[PDB]
């Protein structure tokens, strides 16, 4: 049930070990959980 696009207002970043994380600019949340999953 994977999404085809990142939701509006979100950005991907990568931590030093190469693990992605996700920022939600409009709720000011930073999470390891991919919102498309």
Curated annotation (Swiss-Prot):
This is E3 ubiquitin-protein ligase NEDD4. It is found in: Cytoplasm; Nucleus; Cell membrane. Binds, in vitro, through the WW2 and WW3 domains, to neural isoforms of ENAH that contain the PPSY motif. Interacts with BEAN1, LITAF, RNF11, WBP1, WBP2, PMEPAI and PRRG2. Interacts with NDFIP1 and NDFIP2; this interaction activates the E3 ubiquitin-protein ligase and may induce its recruitment to exosomes. Interacts with UBE2D2. Interaction with PTEN is questionable according to PubMed:18562292. Interacts (via C2 domain) with GRB10 (via SH2 domain). Interacts with ERBB4. Transmembrane segments: none annotated. The chain holds residues 841 to 873 of 1319 of the full protein. Residues 5-37 form the WW domain. WW domains are involved in recognizing PPxY motifs in substrate proteins. The WW domains mediate interaction with LITAF, RNF11, WBP1, WBP2, PMEPAI, NDFIP1 and PRRG2. A cysteine residue is required for ubiquitin-thioester formation. E3 ubiquitin-protein ligase which accepts ubiquitin from an E2 ubiquitin-conjugating enzyme in the form of a thioester and then directly transfers the ubiquitin to targeted substrates. Specifically ubiquitinates 'Lys-63' in target proteins. Involved in the pathway leading to the degradation of VEGFR-2/KDFR, independently of its ubiquitin-ligase activity. Monoubiquitinates IGF1R at multiple sites, thus leading to receptor internalization and degradation in lysosomes. Ubiquitinates FGFR1, leading to receptor internalization and degradation in lysosomes. Promotes ubiquitination of RAPGEF2.
């Amino acid at each position: 049930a994977m999404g085809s696009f990142l939701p509006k207002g979100w950005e991907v970043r990568h931590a030093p070990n190469g693990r992605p994380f996700f920022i939600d600019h409009n709720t000011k949340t930073t999470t390891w959980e991919d919102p498309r999953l």
